[PDB]
Design a protein around this ligand. Structure first.
Ligand code: CL
Ligand code: CL
Ligand code: NA
Ligand code: NA
Ligand code: ZN
Length: 315
């Protein structure tokens, strides 16, 4: 009976010594098994594998705790989805564009490129150690593990189309936004005033207009009475806000926003680009970069800096 020593893991930190039989596949011994993203379930141990670390699924009590502490999930297939994505994302390219880690276009990944570029321009800390560790690497330029985690957390495979707003929502749900607060007032002439307080992810996201200034002045929304009510921002305590709307031609004015996402085409058959407002307006499209003093395009998400805002509307 021939054996080698290998290590299994769910977090690539805590290792578990295994003595594996070289006459059996990894799958027969560990269940689904991966070597830096490559699926070795159906393969028998090679000599060169001695001492190497393999990912497995969290299919024992110790691994379940380690996986939950590191990723903050107990989705049974999470690790397989993360490894499957990593096998691809480790071959993607991550060029530095205007001082930020971008992603060379591949596998319909423009939504991930613009999400990744956005994260590097807003104040956000992640909760799962897996995202903390991988995001730090991504800022340094090695974003393969971060991108594979985004895919896994969002239940998207490599190649699958994704929506930036939805992706950001998932990332924000795995971020510490408990210091974020939003107070809204909704005023109908018939029905009166209704104040609502939003916290965390709902405090920094709004769907219906791209303009933070208009949100402060008031936006018209349906009232149940059939008239239009006015919704406006009473109070904001967030380091950023994200304003989203169905893509429409929209002018981005230098110095009035942090960054934005543009979507050209019809739904599920278009492409994202990223616009960042620095010394001028830079348009980052994966590896590609252009500049302009003005910008108009089909914008769908805009990010703004914030600290503390209180309205002056005396209603
Ligand atoms: Cl972080
Ligand atoms: Cl979390
Ligand atoms: Na950031
Ligand atoms: Na949170
Ligand atoms: Zn009403």
């Amino acid at each position: 009976v021939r054996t080698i020593k290998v290590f299994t893991t769910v977090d690539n930190i805590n290792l578990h010594t295994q003595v594996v039989d070289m006459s059996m596949t990894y799958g027969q011994q560990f269940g689904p098994t991966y070597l830096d993203g490559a699926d070795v379930t159906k393969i028998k141990p090679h000599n060169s594998h001695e001492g190497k670390t393999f990912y497995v699924l969290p299919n024992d009590d110790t691994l379940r705790v380690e996986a939950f502490e590191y990723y903050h999930t107990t989705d049974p297939s999470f690790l397989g989805r993360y490894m499957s994505a990593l096998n691809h994302t480790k071959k993607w390219k991550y060029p530095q564009v205007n001082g930020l880690t971008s992603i060379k276009w591949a596998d319909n990944n423009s939504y991930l490129a613009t999400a990744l570029l956005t994260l590097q321009q807003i104040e956000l800390k992640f909760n799962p150690p897996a995202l903390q560790d991988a995001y730090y690497r991504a800022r340094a330029g090695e974003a393969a593990n971060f991108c594979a985690l985004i895919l896994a957390y969002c239940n998207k495979t490599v190649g699958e189309l994704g929506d930036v707003r939805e992706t950001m929502s998932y990332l924000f749900q795995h971020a510490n936004l408990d210091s974020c607060k939003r107070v809204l007032n909704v005023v109908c002439k018939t029905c009166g005033q209704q104040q609502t307080t939003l916290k965390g992810v709902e405090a920094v996201m709004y769907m219906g207009t791209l303009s933070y200034e208009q949100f402060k002045k008031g936006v018209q929304i349906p009232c149940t009475c059939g008239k239009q009510a006015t919704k406006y921002l009473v109070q904001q305590e967030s380091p950023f806000v994200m304003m989203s709307a169905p893509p429409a031609q929209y002018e981005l004015k230098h110095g009035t926003f942090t960054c934005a996402s543009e979507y050209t085409g019809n739904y599920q058959c278009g492409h994202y680009k990223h616009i960042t407002s620095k010394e001028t307006l830079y348009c980052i499209d994966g590896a590609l970069l252009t500049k302009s003093s003005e910008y108009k395009g089909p914008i769908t998400d805009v990010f703004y800096k914030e600290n503390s805002y209180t309205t002056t509307i005396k209603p």
